[PDB]
């Protein structure tokens, strides 16, 4: 299949530069253009620029001075770099490929890189258990991390039905907090193990928290 | 640049209903418009290119029409998995620009929340902070009240709520309310209660525990 896989989410200090790598498969960079698009609260979806099959680049007008796109065809890699970020450059960045080599209808997207522009320090979360008509609820409290995001899954991806992972909320401390719950048959608490797999890529903190009835 | 005006901002319909999204351009752009779907935590998914041309793998219930300045994305029989935001994009004029999007919401029957309360873990208490969590699961519609009480005293200002987007399958919401106390305050009191008020309950529901 055609895929685009971007590098991981992260913090960038104000006035520093942002770097993202797009690694592609299921097509050759010599045959297609790779576009960059971002998505911000203040401006929604903006098209940023593109590198073509032949290496030419076009940058959207507000970004000509601070934007640079490069690639390594052999490694199937596209390199995005933007200079002097300010806080309203906090956004989700995406690479994308059009349906046809010269066009702009984006049928394939990368998973997006969430970029936070802040002078703050990275901090991994602590994970705490939320301990459990025959339906029990249980979960994980994922507390005090910066920046967004954390991924949470259950039993390494095998448990998904009934799972709710809430939107993160910013505490007064300036750190985020989030809970993830799941409902299960109470009779299964005796025989099944439940683990939430927490992953905070910006701090490289990976925790598996087993959640048992207290 | 071409300004693209999508309307309305929020669309609310019931399943099985036809629904239409509008996208107006600031000057004629021919039929050079593309439409996208974005689901909770997703990247945009291409639904329609050039006003009306179909996309491989996209359900046949999606179609588009229009030419010039006024365009329309249609869903003939809305499903629950269609809960999402919808965006138009023009490419008649460089640079390509996107609209601000339309949010699609689905009505359904009233569903009372299931309420669960979780005391702080002893692990967290070692850290000098206590989080008490109250869960309202699978309810509709979104309006709900969570009221915290500690030893009959009303808590105010020390709680935060988070609400899921609409479930793609049953169209319900879920909500968490977290009460945050210092370990000292938590150790000083006994009865921790969260009272939940919602349209699907004939009276408010309280879940509570006694510390220890």
């Amino acid at each position: 299949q055609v895929q685009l896989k971007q590098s991981g989410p992260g913090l960038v200090q104000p006035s520093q530069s942002l770097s993202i790598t797009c690694t592609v498969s299921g097509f050759s960079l010599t045959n297609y253009g790779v576009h960059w698009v971002r998505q911000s609260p203040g401006k929604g979806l903006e098209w940023l620029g593109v590198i073509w099959s032949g290496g030419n680049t076009d940058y959207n007008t507000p970004f000509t001075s601070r934007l640079s796109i490069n690639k390594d065809n052999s490694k199937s890699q596209v390199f995005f770099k933007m200079n002097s970020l300010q806080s309203n450059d906090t956004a989700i960045y995406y690479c994308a490929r059009a349906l046809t080599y010269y066009d702009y209808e984006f049928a394939y997207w990368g998973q997006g890189t969430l970029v936070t522009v802040s002078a703050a320090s990275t901090k991994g979360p602590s994970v705490f258990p939320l301990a459990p008509g025959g339906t029990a609820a249980l979960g994980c409290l994922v507390k005090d991390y910066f920046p967004e995001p954390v991924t949470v899954s259950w039993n390494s991806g095998a448990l998904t039905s009934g799972v709710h992972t809430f939107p993160a909320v910013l505490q007064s401390s300036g750190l985020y907090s989030l809970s993830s719950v799941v409902t299960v048959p109470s009779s299964s608490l005796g025989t099944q193990t439940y683990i939430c797999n927490v992953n905070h890529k910006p701090s490289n903190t990976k925790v598996d928290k087993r959640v048992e009835p207290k | 640049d071409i300004l693209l005006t999508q309307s309305p901002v929020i669309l609310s319909v019931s399943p099985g209903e036809r629904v239409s999204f509008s996208c107006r351009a600031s000057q004629s752009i021919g039929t050079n418009i593309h439409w996208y779907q974005q689901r909770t935590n997703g990247s945009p998914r291409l639904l329609i290119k050039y006003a009306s041309e179909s996309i491989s793998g996209i359900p046949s219930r999606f179609s588009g029409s229009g030419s010039g300045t006024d365009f329309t994305l249609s869903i003939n029989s809305v499903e629950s998995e269609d809960i999402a935001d919808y965006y138009c994009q023009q490419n008649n004029n460089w640079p390509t620009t996107f609209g601000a999007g339309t949010k699609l919401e689905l009505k359904r029957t009233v569903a009372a929340p299931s309420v669960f309360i979780f005391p702080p873990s002893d692990e967290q208490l070692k850290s000098g902070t206590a989080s008490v969590v109250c869960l309202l699961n699978n309810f509709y519609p979104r309006e709900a009240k969570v009221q915290w009480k500690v030893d009959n005293a009303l808590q105010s200002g020390n709680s935060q709520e988070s609400v899921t987007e609409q479930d793609s399958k049953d169209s319900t919401y879920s909500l968490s309310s977290t009460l945050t106390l210092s370990k000292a305050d938590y150790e000083k009191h006994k009865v921790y209660a969260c009272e939940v008020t919602h349209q699907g309950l004939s009276s408010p529901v309280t879940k509570s525990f006694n510390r220890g």
Binding site: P149, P167 | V9, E165
Partner: peptide
């Protein structure tokens, strides 16, 4: 609506 980075959804 306005785009929310946490959920990638519009929020009013």
């Amino acid at each position: 609506x306005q785009f929310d980075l946490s959920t990638r959804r519009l929020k009013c």
